[PDB]
Amino acid sequence: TLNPSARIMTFYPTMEEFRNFSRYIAYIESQGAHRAGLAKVVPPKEWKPRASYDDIDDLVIPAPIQQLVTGQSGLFTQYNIQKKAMTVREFRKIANSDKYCTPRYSEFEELERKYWKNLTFNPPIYGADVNGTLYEKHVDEWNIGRLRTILDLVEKESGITIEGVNTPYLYFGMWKTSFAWHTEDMDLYSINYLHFGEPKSWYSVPPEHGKRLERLAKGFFPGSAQSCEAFLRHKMTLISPLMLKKYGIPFDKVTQEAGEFMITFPYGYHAGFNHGFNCAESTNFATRRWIEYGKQAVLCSCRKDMVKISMDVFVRKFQPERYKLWKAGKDNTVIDHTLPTPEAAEFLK
C-alpha cells in the first residue's frame, strides 16, 4: 500500500546506500517511488562526477535544434529544426544573451506562467542528443556510461548499440527549451543528471493514469492519432498543467537543480522545460519489472528506424515459464503499475 497518493518522492541516500545503483532503484521502488512516474535522488555531498567543467567550451554540439512551437490554450505542437554545428562556447553566448536569457522572476509559479505564456515566441535552441559523457573514467557510482543494469543484455547478446538508450547523451539547454509529453523508448526507465546550470522543471503523470493521458491526447489531436497509434512518441506534443487539471489527469511537478538526479519509471509520462543555460546527461536503463512493459510497449510505426528492442532475450532468461505462450502470442499478462520490481524483495522482508 506504498505511496498511495502517487506523489513525486525525493531521496537522500548516504554514500553507502548510493554505491550500488540497481539496488538503490529497487529500494526506492520498495518505498512506492515508481507510482509517481518520476523520482528525485539527491546524491551525497562528498560525491562529484567531474572535478571541473572549465574545459568543455570546445565540445561540439553537432546538430542543435531550434524549437518552433505552434498552438494555443494549453495545447501545442513543437517542430524541432536542426541547425548547423556549434560549440558549447557558441551556445552559451546565445543562451545568456539579452535575446534568449531567462526572464526576471520571483516565485517559480511566476517563471512557469511566463513559460506557458511565451513558449510560442522567440524560438530557442536546444543543444540536445549530443553523444558523450561528462563523468570522469574512474567514477564508479551512478555512472550514466555504465549503470550495470539488465538493459546491458541488448549489447551483450546481439552487439546492438542504440545511441541515447544504451549509451549516454548530453543536453545543453537554454531558457524555454522544452521536452514534450512522452514515455521512454520501449517504455524503459531513464536517469537524468543535471551537471550544472539553471534548473530543469518536470511534469509527470503516474503510470497508472497513463492511458487516461493518451485518451485525452488522442481527442485533442485526432488527426495525429488517426495516422499513428503512438504519436506521443514523436515527442512533438505539449500540454499545459492547467489543461491536465481541466480534464482530471493526475500529475505532479518537480524542479531538478544542478547536482540532482531524476529517475523516470516505465510508462511514466513526463514533460518539462529548462530555466536557462544548463547541461544534463541522460540514458535509459531496465529492471526485471521493465520486461513486461517492454513486451507490451505500443510503438511508433510511421517513422523509419524508430527504437525497437528484441524482447526475446529477456523473456527467455527471466520468464522461461511464459516464453512458449508469449511466442504463440497468448501471453495475456496484465500489468499492475503499483507493484515494485522483484529485486525490491530484499527491502520488504
Partner: peptide
C-alpha cells in the same frame, strides 16, 4: 536506431 529529443 537512436534516441531523439523530438521530430518535426
Amino acid at each position: 536506431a537512436r534516441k531523439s529529443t523530438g521530430g518535426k
